[PDB]
Design a protein around this ligand. Structure first.
Ligand SMILES: CNC(=O)Cc1ccc(Oc2nc3ccc(F)cc3s2)cc1O
Ligand SMILES: CNC(=O)Cc1ccc(Oc2nc3ccc(F)cc3s2)cc1O
Lengths: 426, 424
């Protein structure tokens, strides 16, 4: 069945004329090959959708395990192209065990070599879980992962999927270096991208792209899952960086169960492969599930604290508009040993908005006030409260912000901090 | 003397007369002390519910951090007694910062010294997240947040009692004792129902395996009830137990049972606690909402947990182990230390009837509608005779040994003892 022929799929993915088979073709249901991706030595394996639906058996699984063993030994990235209905039922338990051995190999590779899955067709049973164990999953629209968060990148078509896969091994395996000249040349007034009013929502994504190199794609992960949080890989003066940013357009930009988990997973992934982090903070609080279930955000929030806390790659924080309460601590604060914390001049760092704060601290005085005088008293109390608290100057005194910067130098200030940090220690 | 008094609470927790304060008592909202729990040196801190509802401030947080540093230095377990509304609003960002420094100390301690949280009063904001970063959380009733609490006590005093026991489980792990294993052997199989199609609570099985004297400290009994996990002692040695529970969801794996098992596996692995995995699982379930996202993601995490695990971990198949769930429940392919099976156990891709319906679907379809439902039975009968049995699994090599259920304890104990403390 030509289009799903594994040699062809492997050929479309690798650099032209670089494919070198790791074993002889057969009817096992997988073909594994060595090759190159823009010069980078890469291992890949393709399930054979032209043989029994691509169903996995002992012999095919063995080829994948050998492929993994090969990539591990040479420290090469390994890409799996997936199209498969699951384990070969007629092989019984023997196939279950072999599928398990595939899992076990992916686990040995975890955080040691990059693992990229490209799902180009139906993926079920063991063929759904395999990709779930890898670092990044690319899905072509002629696919579905069955047996939401599982899929990181959705491509336009099978060829686009290979193209994104190729870029991903570039981001992991040709990380480059920071360049000050390039960082400065790309500087613009990122602050101008915000709305005029502090109360208005906006998509954070243009801020992100303005920080990142103009001529390089921002590869956003899981865009439609936990949309209050944006995460992804891009280049900053040519250097691969990971970006996390609250997106005020969705849920006020609040943290919650899924956004915390999304951010936590992405942090551990960048940490594992030496990829520095830009954390763009504009977060006013956090949220329970619709049913007032707080257990999710607690558990996942703790996982996020733990991820930043244990992180050792450079990770710099930029407060754009506001950062409040517990969500402030979680978003790469000084208390979790952020490399450096930056703030735009009109940013707020506080427990909560002044009016909210004052409305708690002086609940009794406010309620004792005459109804028609109450709001004026509330406003006046709030004005004094923010005279003394919430501002960048105050945050600099405390030492939770390191530097107030000109928004027009954002891109070059972040770059300077990341470049001059140690590769490891936080 | 007020019940919420931090010195009182610390004194009730520690061995009588052992308390030694780590700082001068003050208005900070925290008191921290050294002491012993059945002989072992332990550090503890207690939030002061009498001062501002126990709200966390800069100076109180500093006492907590110091206690963590002290514990990290001496490699002592550290117990937090929590009763607190969260950060002191009026101290502003400084209090937030200090709370974050408490988080950071807990993270530095993570997997290095045991951390126990005893929540005896209202706990909110930063005071809910503190405990969430520890290893085991005990809650007194007097204090929706599903999955966060590991153990519910009967009251405050019982909570200290369970906490004290947890220190012993983590810091007095002991040695396996082959003679005590044997002395406790019984026919555990006799606890199974007559029919293999009948559901049962797996907890008495777990109980019969564990030491008859020692309590079974179940974690999160009410969350993900198709999965049972907890700590106990096997022949005097602290072990972790995971067991499918056929009583709920047919004992199937699903999104939250995979999560519950994975977190527990990672905890035991962190502290050198060997695992006993009691398997009776017919398959796995999707979400709500036939979405597979949760089970795919959490299941993957469970695979990762067993795969990377280096403590001894032995599997015992009692009745069923099917398909993908078979793989995940500590199979040979994920380097299980050893895999045991009772004589009647099935290790298979699915039920024989179901298996045949797919393996022979074209041939079943091509048969006359009247003589099909009888051919199905015939083919299932042949299938059942050549696949699915322990003997088959033994030959394949995914079961190491079929065992007399009357010798479960000693067999498990022998396999756990012979394994290295770290490999697999
Ligand atoms: C009474 N008010 C307080 O105590 C303030 C406060 C302080 C810390 C805190 O901890 C965390 N919050 C999050 C929120 C999201 C997330 F993903 C992680 C965390 S950790 C939570 C808090 O309400
Ligand atoms: C076509 N049929 C198959 O391919 C059978 C099959 C094989 C492997 C598999 O992988 C996993 N399953 C789970 C289930 C729960 C869980 F918590 C983890 C895993 S991993 C899943 C499978 O349906």
């Amino acid at each position: 069945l030509d289009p799903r022929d594994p040699l062809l799929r492997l050929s479309n993915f690798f650099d032209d004329g670089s494919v070198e088979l790791l074993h002889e073709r057969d009817r096992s249901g997988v073909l594994a090959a060595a090759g190159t991706v823009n010069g980078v030595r890469t291992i890949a394996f393709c399930t054979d959708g032209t043989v029994m639906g691509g169903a996995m058996g002992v012999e095919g699984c063995t080829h994948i395990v050998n492929a993994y063993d090969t990539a591990i030994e040479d420290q090469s990235p390994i890409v799996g192209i997936w199209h498969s209905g699951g384990a070969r039922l007629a092989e019984g338990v023997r196939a279950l065990h072999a599928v398990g051995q595939v899992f076990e190999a992916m686990i040995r590779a975890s955080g040691y070599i990059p693992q990229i899955s490209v799902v180009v067709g139906f993926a079920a049973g063991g063929a759904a879980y395999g990709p779930a164990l890898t670092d990044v999953v690319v899905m072509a629209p002629e696919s579905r992962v069955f047996v939401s968060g599982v899929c990181h990148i959705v491509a336009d078509d099978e060829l686009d999927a290979y193209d994104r896969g190729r870029r991903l091994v570039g981001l992991f395996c040709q990380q480059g270096h920071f360049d000050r000249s390039k960082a400065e040349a790309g500087d613009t007034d990122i602050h101008a991208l915000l709305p005029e009013s502090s109360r208005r929502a906006y998509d954070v994504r243009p801020i992100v792209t303005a920080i990142l190199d103009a001529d390089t794609p921002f590869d956003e992960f899981q865009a439609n899952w936990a949309p209050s949080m944006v995460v992804g890989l891009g280049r900053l003066s040519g250097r691969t960086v990971g970006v996390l940013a609250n997106n005020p357009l969705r849920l006020g930009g609040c943290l919650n169960s899924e956004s915390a988990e999304k951010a936590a997973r992405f942090v551990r992934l960048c940490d594992a492969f030496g990829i520095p982090l830009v954390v763009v903070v504009d977060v006013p609080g956090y949220l329970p599930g619709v049913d007032q279930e707080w257990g999710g955000v607690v558990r996942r929030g703790a996982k996020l604290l733990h991820a930043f806390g244990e992180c050792t790659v450079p990770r710099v924080t930029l407060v754009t508009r506001k950062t409040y309460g517990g969500a402030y601590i979680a978003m790469n604060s000084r208390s979790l040993n952020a490399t450096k914390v930056f703030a735009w001049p009109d940013a707020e760092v506080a427990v909560m908005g002044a009016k909210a704060a004052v409305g708690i601290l002086h609940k009794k005085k406010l309620a004792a006030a005459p109804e028609h005088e109450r709001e004026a008293l509330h406003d006046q109390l709030a004005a004094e409260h923010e005279r003394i608290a919430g501002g960048v100057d105050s945050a600099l005194d405390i030492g939770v912000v390191d530097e107030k910067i000109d928004p027009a130098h954002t891109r070059s200030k972040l770059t300077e901090a990341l470049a001059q940090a140690p590769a490891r220690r936080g």
